[PDB]
Each structure stands twice: as C-alpha cells, then as structure tokens.
Amino acid sequence: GHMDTIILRNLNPHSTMDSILGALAPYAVLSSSNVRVIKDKQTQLNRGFAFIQLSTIVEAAQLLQILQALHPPLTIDGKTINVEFAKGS
C-alpha cells in the first residue's frame, strides 16, 4: 500500500519538480534526494508520476486526507497532480 511514498500522478513531462515539491510536501521533509519522476534517459522526460517519500509508511496514509484539504487545487501545465499511494507488492 503506502510504502512511505505517495505517487504524484499526472506529473507533466516539463513541470518543474521544484514548484510541485512544497505544493505536495508540507510535512514530507525532502528537497532533492527523493525527487524521482521515474524520468527517462532517451527523452529526459518525467514519466507522469513522482515518488514523494514520507516521514513514515503511516503518515503517508494520513497526509492523503490532510494535504488536499489545505492550499488551492494544484494545477501546473494544466495537469492536476493526482494523489495515489506507492503500491509495490
């Protein structure tokens, strides 16, 4: 389920992770050493999903019912960031 990470889906191929970062990480204590939009190597684009790690596997589930209740609806490059969990087995 939560895996200490929230998948910022809809992550536009040219959105600046830096404007997305605080806009989806008021409590996740990150800057650079987590910021992985699964980005390519041939095209150097964001895949459409970023792995914002958390402070715990627990806080991830709770932040998903706090964050959107705060701040305006985030929309960069006309993509609403979706708020999915890092399901990996």
Curated annotation (Swiss-Prot):
Q: Which residues carry this modification: N6-acetyllysine?
A: 87
Q: Which superkingdom?
A: Eukaryota
* Chain ranges of the RRM domain: 4-88
The subcellular localization recorded is: Nucleus
Q: Which residues form a coiled coil?
A: none
Q: Its quaternary structure?
A: Associates with the spliceosome. Component of a large chromatin remodeling complex, at least composed of MYSM1, PCAF, RBM10 and KIF11/TRIP5.
User: Which disease does its entry mention?
Assistant: TARP syndrome: A disorder characterized by the Robin sequence (micrognathia, glossoptosis and cleft palate), talipes equinovarus and cardiac defects.
User: What further note is attached to this protein's record?
Assistant: RBM10 transcripts also code for an alternative open reading frame (alt-ORF) coding for the MINAS-60 (AC P0DW28) protein. MINAS-60 and RBM10 ORFs are overlapping and are formed by shifting the reading frame.
Question: What does the UniProt record say this protein does?
Answer: Binds to ssRNA containing the consensus sequence 5'-AGGUAA-3'. May be involved in post-transcriptional processing, most probably in mRNA splicing. Binds to RNA homopolymers, with a preference for poly(G) and poly(U) and little for poly(A). May bind to specific miRNA hairpins.
Name-wise, this protein is: RNA-binding protein 10
Taxonomic lineage is: Eukaryota, Metazoa, Chordata, Craniata, Vertebrata
Full-protein residues shown:
300 to 385 of 930
